Amino acid sequence: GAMDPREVILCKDQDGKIGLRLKSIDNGIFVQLVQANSPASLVGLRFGDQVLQINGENCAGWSSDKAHKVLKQAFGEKITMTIRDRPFERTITMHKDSTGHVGFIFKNGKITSIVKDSSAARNGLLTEHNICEINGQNVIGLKDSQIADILSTSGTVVTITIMPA
Amino acid sequence: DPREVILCKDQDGKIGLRLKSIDNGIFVQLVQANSPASLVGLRFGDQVLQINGENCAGWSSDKAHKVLKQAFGEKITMTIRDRPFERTITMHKDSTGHVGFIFKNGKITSIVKDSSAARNGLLTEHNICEINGQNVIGLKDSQIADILSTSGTVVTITIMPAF
Amino acid sequence: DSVF
Numbered sequence: 001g002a003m004d005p006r007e008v009i010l011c012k013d014q015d016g017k018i019g020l021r022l023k024s025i026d027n028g029i030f031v032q033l034v035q036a037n038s039p040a041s042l043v044g045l046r047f048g049d050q051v052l053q054i055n056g057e058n059c060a061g062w063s064s065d066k067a068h069k070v071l072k073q074a075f076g077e078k079i080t081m082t083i084r085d086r087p088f089e090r091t092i093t094m095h096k097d098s099t100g101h102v103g104f105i106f107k108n109g110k111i112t113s114i115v116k117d118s119s120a121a122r123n124g125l126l127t128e129h130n131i132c133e134i135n136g137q138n139v140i141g142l143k144d145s146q147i148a149d150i151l152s153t154s155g156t157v158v159t160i161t162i163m164p165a
Numbered sequence: 166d167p168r169e170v171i172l173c174k175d176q177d178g179k180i181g182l183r184l185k186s187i188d189n190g191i192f193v194q195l196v197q198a199n200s201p202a203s204l205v206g207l208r209f210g211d212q213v214l215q216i217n218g219e220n221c222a223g224w225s226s227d228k229a230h231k232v233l234k235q236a237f238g239e240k241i242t243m244t245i246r247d248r249p250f251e252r253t254i255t256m257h258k259d260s261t262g263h264v265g266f267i268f269k270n271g272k273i274t275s276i277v278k279d280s281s282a283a284r285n286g287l288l289t290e291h292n293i294c295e296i297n298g299q300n301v302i303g304l305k306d307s308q309i310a311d312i313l314s315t316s317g318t319v320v321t322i323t324i325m326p327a328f
Numbered sequence: 329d330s331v332f
Contacts, residue, residue, distance in 0.1 A: 003253065005286075026288040026326075027276045052286045060276050060283035084286055087252045088326065114189050114222045121222035124167075124214040124246055126188040164188070164250065164326055263331050277331055306329055313332040 005052055005082045008043040012076030022051060022067040029059035029067050033141060046086065047132055047140040048163045053082040086163060089132070094119035094158045102151070102158050106131060109139065109147060110165050119158075129162040167214050170205040172241045180241065182207065184229040187328045190214075191221040191229050195303060208248060209294055209302040210325050215244040248325070251294075255321040256281040264313070264320045268293060269306060272327050281320075291324040 010018050019038020022029050031049040034040045051059050054070055062070070071079075094102040096119070103118020104111055104125055111127045114120050131139055134150050135158065142150075151158065172180050181200025184191050193211040196202045213221050216232055224232075233241065256264040258281065265280020266273050266287055273289050276282050293301055293309060297316060301309050313320065 026290045028286055028288050050286055052284070058279070058283045060286065061278065088250050090249050116223065117220070121220045122214075124190055124212055124222065126190050128188045164328075265331065267329060267331055269329065310329050310332060 003084075005084045008045070008081050008083055010039045010043060010079045010081065012074075012079070013039055016076060018071065018079065020045065020071060022064065022071070024062060024064045024067065027061050028052075029062055045083065046138065048086040048089065048130075050084040050087055051081055052084055053080075055080055086132075088163055089161060090126075090129075090163070091159060091161045092120075092123050092125055094123050094125070094160070096154070096156045096158065100152065106147065107144060109142070109144065111162065125160070126162065126164075128165050130165045131160060132163055133159075133161040135159050167244045167246045170207070170243050170245055172201045172205055172243065174239050174241070175201055178234075180233065182233070184213065184226060184233070186224060186226045186229070189223050191216075191224055191226075207245070209300075210248040210250055212246040212249050213243050214246055215242075217242050218244075250325045251323055252288075252291075252325070253295075253321060253323045254285050254287055255319060256285050256287070258316070258318045258320060268309065271301070271304070271306065271309060273324065287322075288324065290327050292327045293322060294325055295323040297321055 012018055018040045019035030020040040021033035023032040029051045031045055031047055034045050053059060096102055103115035103120035105113040109131055111125060111129045113127060114125055131147060133139060135154060137150060139147050174180055180202050181197030182193060182202040183195040185194035191213040193207050193209055196207050196209060215221060217236060258264050265277035265282035267275045271293050273287060273291050275289060276287055295301060296312050299312060
């Protein structure tokens, strides 16, 4: 079902890459960066997805450097991974007011304050949360001023996907 | 989508709820047994978006407590986002009895190599909220330990990040 | 605790 893992089979590209960076968090391994137009992007991987197994081996307790090593060294033609889609994701839909604002401040891609009596306040937007997607667009790796441009140019309905940092 | 609940204070003016400020929202932190709060199905980790139509955004735990105490009348309305940080994971004890983690103060602190906890992606620095349908929030570690030890092979645990 |  929805909460259960999915299986992907990847192949390293002509540069020997799958376009994936992983990190150890809380004794699991999580996707930290997915390259555009990569083997990893092409099986739907994204920031915050949890990697349970690579080539049948449990990722539990691996360090970030160990995960890097395993990917670098992995036989390129068939890399299997067992993926738990981003645990703890929340999608919040807000609406711009007469001023163009939904009602939050952010810094280094993480929400830091919620404006009183705003759409963000009404819809329970939370701080210390990474902004993952705005209106479907991946913003991981973008500068704050780039994130600001996406928000400023958005139509009235602003949909944000967030995850606790 | 959030849901509306209407709680009716008890005799003593209480609803059997403790709230906590986390990430500039308000969350249910302890729900008393057989209470006005348990009656309406509130659980540890539920997010409270509004109390009597007032936004909870940015409220301190103290402010929230005071609002509940000051609420006019006998009924309190809350707008609730059900447990937004819930992850439920089913593990299976191995042939000699463990699922493969250590915990303390109701929080998972390590995962054993080659265990069912490892296979199923259990995370550390997460609170243990339910085990096999049993609420364990507020229980002593020894009580949690006993539930785990006496469990059948299948051990399904609901966890949430320890904020 | 111990392992569970």
